[PDB]
Structure 1
Amino acid sequence: ARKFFVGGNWKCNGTAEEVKKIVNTLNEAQVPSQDVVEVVVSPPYVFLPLVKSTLRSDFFVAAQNCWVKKGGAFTGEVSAEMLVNLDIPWVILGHSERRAILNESSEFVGDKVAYALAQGLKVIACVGETLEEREAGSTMDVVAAQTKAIADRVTNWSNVVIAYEPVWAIGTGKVASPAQAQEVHDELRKWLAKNVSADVAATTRIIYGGSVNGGNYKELGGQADVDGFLVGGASLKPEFIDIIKAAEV
């Protein structure tokens, strides 16, 4: 069985004082065993050393982004090899905000994933459709195309988690149902089985990155093809511990 996965994306938030409070709360948390759930927290770049130095060793740290290739003359960017040097094991790549606001193309995301994996990082690779795409019946075309841009560029899926983000249902007031989430995760896994291998389809975690009303995480987690959550604002709050606890059963 795939190990349930909960990632916390802090986004562009945090102060030294807020980080200390979040980390102390996570360090005091009593959650399901390492065998039941894998937990990753993703602070901004400037707090990565602080969080890695202070967080419980059974929770893992992710950067929110890295550069597409080897470092060098790329003012403002952080390379995968820098993250490896700082003992940051994970990175989030292709988040909806970077695809939309920072205009990161599916091919650019794919090249980042492949480079990160080559340096030995583990990757949360994000995909998802807009409202226009959803309403046109294009959800499965769009999610398969974003996944194919990554698949075409990687040589190994072992250290990849895919995060599905229904962009129309993230902080818009619209919420996708469990059935809607299950349908996309099932079709995506079926895509991996036909286009990469049955083994990769069976072993790759596909986590849900859509907005969820309080108390509705266990109904989503219990869907057959949903393997956990990529969490936004709740990752800054004690509620994140209740999302980790949804891994139980």
Structure 2
Amino acid sequence: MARKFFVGGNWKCNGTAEEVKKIVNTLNEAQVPSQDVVEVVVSPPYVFLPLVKSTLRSDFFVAAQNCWVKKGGAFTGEVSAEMLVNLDIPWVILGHSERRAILNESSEFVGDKVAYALAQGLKVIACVGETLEEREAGSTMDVVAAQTKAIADRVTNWSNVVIAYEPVWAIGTGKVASPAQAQEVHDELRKWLAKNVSADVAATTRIIYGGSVNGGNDKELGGQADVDGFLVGGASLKPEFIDIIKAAEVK
């Protein structure tokens, strides 16, 4: 069966109560493809998770932007997976490029987080991706495979995992990634999954594109054979996010 298209919206470290209410109302009024065609997840900052979950349309789902690596306790400032489950938040983003680079999250730390979140029943958007220096050194797939392997070594069931490929090399660097360049990475990553996990896991796991997505490239990216959707950044705060969801429709 064909993989269901997946559109996640990562709000990042943005939002006020007033803006969140406007964003949620615009999402609630949106008219998008059916639940059989597209799965939509939105990811507010921690402090807005209860507000968004309480007010968002029930056919769109909520994700935290991170969670802690293990059971809660004496970890000042952290939010545990079981807290998210208590608040009925079904998804979490883990290993985002900004946390790997700025907050120095290692590939093994990310892998441990994925395993713990899955064990607590959360669904996970697990992020991977290489920098410009890594790409220009010829290391794109070496890096992406190593990041993915640290997760795969700790995952026994991929049902509740979506992989997001972030072309960090093409985010704020002056380089523009083409749909063909996205497809090349997604294809090679899926082939890696087939060999290192199983053919079935490769065929069924969504691999979503986490680069710049907009009206000029969303249909072109979404129609690539190994691109199963998007992890959207700044447009996720804006009405433009709705048009990105609509790219799931192929009439």
TM-score (norm 2): 0.98
* Distance change in 2, residues 1:202/1:177 (3 Å): same
Q: Tell me if the contact between 1:186 and 1:225 (Cα under 8 Å) persists in the aligned partners.
A: yes
Deviation at 1:173, TM superposition (A): 3.4
Cα pair 1:171 1:211 within 8 Å, conserved: no
* Matches for 1:135-150 after TM superposition, within 5 Å: 135-150=136-151
Q: Give yes or no for contact 1:114–1:154 (8 Å, CA) kept in 2.
A: yes
User: Helix, strand or coil for the counterpart of 1:247?
Assistant: coil
Aligned-residue offset at 1:41 = 0.1
Q: Distance in 1 between matches of 2:215 and 2:86?
A: 38
Gaps of 5+ in 1: none
Deviation at 1:215, TM superposition (A): 2.3
Give how far 1:246 is off. 0.2
- How far residue 217 of structure 1 moved from its aligned partner, in angstroms, is 0.5
Contact map agreement 1:175 1:210 (CA 8 A) in 2: no
Question: d(CA) in 2 for partners of 1:214 and 1:173?
Answer: 19
Give the drift of 1:76. 0.2
Report if the CA contact (8 A) 1:175-1:212 is conserved. no
- Distance in 1, matches of 2:160 and 2:245, equals 20
Using the alignment, how far apart are the partners of 1:35 and 1:77 within structure 2? 35
Contact 2:215-2:243 at 8 Å conserved across structures: no
| C-alpha deviation, 1:213, in angstroms | 4.8
Q: Distance in 1 between matches of 2:214 and 2:31?
A: 23
1:136: Cα distance to partner?
1.2
Residues of 2 paired with 1:171 and 1:83: CA distance? 32
Instruction: Supply the distance in 2 between the matched residues of 1:47 and 1:244 (Cα, whole angstroms).
Output: 22
1:211 deviates by 1.5
SS in 1 for 2:219: helix
Deviations 1:200-225 (A, max 9, x none): 00000000001235321000000000
The answer on whether the counterparts of 2:213 and 2:230 sit within 8 Å (CA) in structure 1 is no
Structure 1 residue 175, shift from structure 2 partner: 1.8
- Alignment check: 8 A CA contact 1:9 1:41 kept: yes
Q: Whole-Å Cα distance in 1 between the matches of residues 213 and 96 of structure 2?
A: 17
Measured in 1, the distance between the counterparts of 2:117 and 2:152 equals 14
User: Percent identity between the aligned chains?
Assistant: 100
Cα deviation code 1:20-39 (max 9, x no counterpart): 00000000000000000000
Structure 2, unaligned runs of 5 or more: none
